[PDB]
């Protein structure tokens, strides 16, 4: 329902990100899309995960200096060892999703942000990712150029 | 008209939480994996370490490269000779290679002894040269393997009380005798009348040699073996005995046939045993029986300033001759050993016994400048924290631990929609 | 002063969320209720508390194996164990609160968009939580509609 | 007209801080909190456990499962006889059943002893009994910690070298004597004017028993205790003396009055002592004076694949008999050795000594799949990584640790407003 | 562009917060300022500074408890702690810096707010931190009043 | 029109990232730094330590506080005495101070010893006390290490067996003898035609000493040094010998010159030597020669309840005397000790030999209620974890880890921009 909500969709329909629209007629029916030019957020994608690298990089980049002289496998202590590196491993990563998470919605927010300075401000904000236009100021090519569909 | 971005997922998508946002998206993909492992020898320190070998690290042969099992950069860093082992420079027996064995390095590289095998035919009376290997072996490892440095002491200073005992000979050993021990006989002790005196002496441990500190030495302290009191009472009368001291009359070693039963194999006739001990700096005692007496002559020399688990490479010859796996048994039964072994067997490029092709592919981590950790599993680089099975002890470095591949998380990719609130 | 703010209150007064408003006059001099029926964050609240259960379990799994043979305690080694497990406690929490208060501002942001999405565009957003309306256009009965109070 | 949500907080409400958010609330509740602490024995690993009892965990007993402190499913993982102790095992003595206690597993569970104890009346000779029991409970827990099995080994292969001694038979003895130590001696031997000969003799360890292998030994190495060198002298000529020797001639135990001081009791007449020592496998010498000799017969075997810290169970009769605590002290001086001990007297449901209510409660645990930590405190579930007093060593498993309540950080409750930026 | 970016300048030019502003004559060309009053801005880097001091003395108090009567440095171990102790303060660091990011942000919105609610509705939001105002029912000294420049 | 908040950044700020949050700015500052190490003794717990020493730590000297290099409440922590030294309690030589050092303290300082150096010019055949002194210290603080509490023990129960043997006297020990060992000669042996019966004796180390515990002792095995054969002959027939042994007869000790080389310097007469021992509590006996017996008759006992890394002082005279640094290396050769050295001479107050600057500046933190850490490069409040360079060990408590200035993280400051998003 704009930008704070994520919704459920059945069998096939596409996920992802697509143009919903409103009333009209009162009451109306709305419509949502089939997806839009938001190359933007493909681009963002790419660029967010890959500086995910530095995060591994560094969790990859630390090996504990250990010597065992002993013959036969101390596999308790061993696995033990293995459960703590996961372990932090686990919260670096419930670190890194929500980095993801919160720098993604930040760049939804500054697409949101470039579609209100172009229709300024016949947009409206309605909360992040809407807007009420007036339909009778700007039209069919007024909302065209300022939503690109 | 209110218009909307409009966010919605699938089936196909699922939901990954976040501390501050959670995140939707269709696929995973792992954050990290395992490190692959290579088998053989390896050093994770290129400026430490120390070889010690024989024709097969030796650059100086007439056929290297093609007798050898490391390239030219690997066999600098080896002290080595053809025709050496260890135990061959322990005991010089006659007419063998008397390689000076001397280095530092806190990694160690052990990959010699083959040249002192059931194959050499040394007899000198040994009751069982092969079980006196695996015991020299494993002294040299435990010493090895909290020492910096090694060194032979090629000669000990050494004195006998008695004034008319002689230097044996044996027709079994060449017609001469090992260089350690030495053998002092005296030929008027005959069970007619005569019984002789008491010998005695002394060897002296000393606390260096050349430029090496000595904490610790690896000797042998050998003693004549005999089937029982009858037949040692055709050499000698009373029971047979060789004693070793320390500086106050602590026993230390020898065999006492006073106390001790016989044991010696039956119509095997005399045998030597030379067990060896892990011994102080100082000065010993020795008492014996009349008519023999065993005095230690050298020594290898380790200081106690520490060092890493070492490596033992397997040698043993082609098919063709007479091998043993006493240096592998000593480094079982030993702490802090890693050893390196064949799958297939020993075939050379210069001659049966020198320049094989899986011993080079083995040895050729050592080698590398990105080892990071050295273990009985093989050796690693630092890519990842985690290796897939564990990597057996003993081992050194930056060690991956095992972990199973389902519980390294994983990261969105693919398509990703962001989460936060309750959306409800 | 409207979700991106919290305030202060004397010996009494209930603590929480309110409807607070307006001038009029010229100038007026405002006014706060008495609570909502924001029962969404009643839900919300509970919701989100059950989930720190997941970090929670996480931590409580987490038991490093050992092997002591000694017959004495070793009090200064033991206490530093659990001096450490306890640090690594302490940055759960600060991660759990704050992942609680962020989801909770996130919710609180999806009531307000809710309401702003009833009076469209009577609504007209002021920041988070706030709104101005025509007090002409819509009235009495309307912002009872729009805010339910 | 500007209508808003307002946010407020009482001064009921405080802040709790967050790494990218705060948070007001009114009530806290903490994160987590201590595991339960449960008194008595149990195992981290149903599959790898072994036990060692006597009739209260001898499913096959006449009166199961009233003469038991354990469940049947329990039971069988014991190797137990009615009347058994490992003590009674190693001696043999007279009439006393003569279990063959052997089995395997890392975790180990010792609940016998009491078949010996003062009550049992046993002389034949002892100089002190409990001594003895406690100084061989001792050596079996120091011996089992490190080893992943256990066997009796019922019979040593033994050689006498005298021609004429005896075996040697007790009034204080039910008329006979032990199984180990044999007791040989030399009835002509008078000091009249006749000394007799210095005896000898050989017993070996072996280096395996059955499918059980062998790294170590307990056996006992007795000697007799005299008063003096007079009162010896009505028995033998010279000084009293019995020692035993490895296959060097290394003395490794024994009594030799030769160059120490008599200390028998005075006016007890002879006594026997039986230290316990462990010792590798391999061929032993004796040698004792004329008239007598004793060689140990059996043993029990340990490898060194090694094992986890031991349980040991209080061994003790109903208030009725003369009971001992040498195991108690026995487990107390042993690294590696937890010690279960009841507090409040013995009282059996089929007879006063068998099926004890306090004791079914501790052993209850043996018992259970979920225990992950067991320690001298007792043992634990895996709830939270946290417990409210120590868990005292011995110890092994997933360990919880101790901390004070208040260290335990919170989180917030009932009626949450959260907080970001300065707000001002 | 408001709140939600962040741009780059050349040589000179000072860095910071400045007020920018948009069209007018069809088309016009913008402009940007040279600096507010944003002394709250200044005073309130100052408090989320201090603040982080909480979280660097959790770290400084926090020393294990250790016990060698080895004579001789283990060098290797020795730094192997260090490592691990350098990679907790990392991860710490990471949190404390998006501490400050986030609610250096939420400290901006809360500026921007401020404003909105002093020409209200004369302010009309852009998305954070942009504004649009009619040229015409507010002025010169209206502008002054509600920017304060 | 459009109006905005604009946001923008130089070259000269910088990008910081967080998790979920960057920071632009243009200064960094360091998250933390390290902490100071200050040279010299300190503790961790001011209720768990105790110091050993002389006049330098006296409250009770004539000169206090001019004579001290403690101020008044650190010297109430020391058990001290003018003149004495735990060597000197040791053997309790003639017209020397006997302090019964006694205390306990997890945490230990020992800062005597200088009363008994070269200086002191004691005789008494020693063939080398400063040999002696090094041998005994590090015996000591071998002891010390694993033990709460240590005691002098002033008076062991001995026993002779000669009747006839009676107590020696020299002139080289001022015409009297040591407290420790006790000296038995034999007037009537002499190589004439007589050469006597071998001495026998007992001593017993107690299994406590007052309210102290003793499981380890500390005590001298002394024993003749003769050049040879040939010169012990004009004091005794045979070989010379003092062999101490434990209740069994195994040998614990001595000087055995039946089957040891004799070792006396050439000419230099007979000596004694009295190398210590860490001994269990027991019996203990003593076989010698007829003509010379030696018996030791004091302790140092300690307990096994543990204790932490100790603290050894440097105990050296002014410059005008002769120093020795036997108790600097034995510290050296010793696990767990730690040893405090002054860089410049040392200079009284009082007189020459008590009170000096530099040695209470070390001392100084003996002293202080807010150390966390001790090592052997000095010790360290709580400041932060790190330091600069390595604390070299022994070293215990809250220890501080090395790490490179360059790898602590910093944080922005002095003007900062937020960024998140991609902003493109
Ligand atoms: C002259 O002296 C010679 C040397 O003493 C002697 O030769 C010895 O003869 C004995 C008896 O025939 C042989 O014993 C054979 O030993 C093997 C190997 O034992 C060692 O390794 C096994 C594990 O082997 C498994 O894994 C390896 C790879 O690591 C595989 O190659 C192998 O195929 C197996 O799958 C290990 O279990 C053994 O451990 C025992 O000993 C150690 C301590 O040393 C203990 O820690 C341990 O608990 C256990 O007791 C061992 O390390 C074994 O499997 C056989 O059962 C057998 O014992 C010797 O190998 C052999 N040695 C040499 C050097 O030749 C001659 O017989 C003698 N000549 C005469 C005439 O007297
Ligand atoms: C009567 O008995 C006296 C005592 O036995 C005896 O005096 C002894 O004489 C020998 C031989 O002259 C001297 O040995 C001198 O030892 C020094 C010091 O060795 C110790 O310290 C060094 C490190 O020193 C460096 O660092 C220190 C600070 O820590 C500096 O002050 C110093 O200047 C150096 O830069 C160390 O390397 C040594 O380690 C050896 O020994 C230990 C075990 O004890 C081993 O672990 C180690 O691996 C190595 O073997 C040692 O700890 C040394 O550098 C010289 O080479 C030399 O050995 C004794 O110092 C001296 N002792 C005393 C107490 O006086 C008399 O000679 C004798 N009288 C007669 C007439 O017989
Ligand atoms: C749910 O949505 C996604 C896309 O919104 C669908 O995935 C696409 O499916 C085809 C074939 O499976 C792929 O070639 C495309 O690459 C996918 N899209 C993307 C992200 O590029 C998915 O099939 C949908 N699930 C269902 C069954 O409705
Ligand atoms: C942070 O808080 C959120 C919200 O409470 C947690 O999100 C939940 O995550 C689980 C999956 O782990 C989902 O089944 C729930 O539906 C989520 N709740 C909501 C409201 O979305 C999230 O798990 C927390 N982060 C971490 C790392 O624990
Ligand atoms: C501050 O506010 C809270 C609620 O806003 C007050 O708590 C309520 O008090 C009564 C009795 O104390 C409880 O039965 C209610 O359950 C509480 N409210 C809630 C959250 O359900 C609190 O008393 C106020 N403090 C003061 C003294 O003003
Ligand atoms: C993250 O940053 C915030 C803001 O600087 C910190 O909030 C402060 O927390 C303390 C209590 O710990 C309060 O007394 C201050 O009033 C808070 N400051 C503000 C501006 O609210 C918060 O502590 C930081 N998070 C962590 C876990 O350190
Ligand atoms: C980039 O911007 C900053 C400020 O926006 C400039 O820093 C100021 O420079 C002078 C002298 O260098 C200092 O005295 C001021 O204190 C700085 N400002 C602040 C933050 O107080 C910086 O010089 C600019 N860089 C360039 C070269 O353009
Ligand atoms: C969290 O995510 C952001 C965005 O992906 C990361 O920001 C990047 O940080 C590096 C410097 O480390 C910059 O060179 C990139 O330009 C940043 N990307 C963006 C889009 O700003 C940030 O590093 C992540 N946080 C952590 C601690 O890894
Ligand atoms: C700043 O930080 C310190 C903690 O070092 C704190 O004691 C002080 O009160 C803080 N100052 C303010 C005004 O927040």
Sequence with gaps: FGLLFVGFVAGGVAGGYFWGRSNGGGGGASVSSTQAGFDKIGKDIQQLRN??????????????????????????????????????????????????????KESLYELANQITKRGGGIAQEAGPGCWYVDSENCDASCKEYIFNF | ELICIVQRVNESFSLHSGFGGNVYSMKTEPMTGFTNVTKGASVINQKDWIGFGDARTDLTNDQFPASSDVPLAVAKKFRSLSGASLMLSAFGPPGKVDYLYQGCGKEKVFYEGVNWSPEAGIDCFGSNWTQTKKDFYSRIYEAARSSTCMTLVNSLDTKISSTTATAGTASSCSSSWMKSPLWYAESSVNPPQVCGTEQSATFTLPTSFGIY????????????????????????????????????????????????????????????????????????????????????????????????????????????????????????????????????????????????????????????????????????????????????????????????????????????????????
Tied chains: 1, 3, 5.
């Excluded at chain 2, 610790?216 to 089937?227: G, S």
């Excluded at chain 2, 009359?249 to 006073?258: A, C, E, F, T, V």
């Excluded at chain 2, 050993?337 to 016994?353: S, W």
Aim: charge should be neutral; aromatic fraction near 8%; include cysteine.
């Design chain 1, 51 to 104: 500086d995910t690298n530095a995060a591994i990089e560094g969790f990859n980049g630390r090996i504990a200096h250990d010597e065992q002289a002993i013959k036969n496998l101390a596999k308790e202590i061993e696995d033990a060892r293995a459960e703590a590196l996961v372990g932090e491993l686990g919260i670096i990563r419930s670190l890194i999703v929500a980095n993801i998470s919160m720098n993604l």
């Design chain 2, 213 to 424: 500190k000595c904490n610790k030495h690896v000797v042998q302290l050998c003693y004549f073996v005999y089937e029982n009191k009858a037949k040692f009472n055709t050499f000698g009368c009373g029971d047979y005995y060789q004693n070793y001291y320390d500086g106050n009359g602590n026993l230390i070693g020898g065999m006492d046939n006073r106390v001790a039963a016989y044991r010696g194999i039956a119509n095997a006739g005399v045998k030597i045993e030379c067990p060896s001990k892990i011994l102080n700096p100082g000065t010993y005692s020795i008492k014996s029986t009349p008519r023999f007496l065993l005095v230690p002559k050298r020594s290898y020399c380790f200081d106690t300033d520490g060092g890493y688990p070492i490596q033992v490479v397997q040698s043993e010859w082609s098919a063709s001759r007479r091998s043993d796996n006493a240096t592998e048994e000593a480094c079982l039964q030993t702490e802090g050993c890693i050893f390196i072994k064949k799958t297939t067997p020993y075939v050379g490029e210069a001659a049966d016994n020198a320049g094989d092709i899986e011993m080079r592919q083995l040895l050729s981590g050592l080698g590398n400048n990105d080892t990071v950790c050295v273990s009985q599993s093989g050796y690693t680089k630092g890519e990842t924290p985690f290796v897939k099975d564990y990597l057996s002890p003993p081992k050194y470095g930056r060690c991956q631990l095992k972990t199973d591949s389902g519980r390294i998380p994983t990261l969105p990719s693919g398509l990703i929609i962001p989460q936060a609130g309750t959306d409800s």
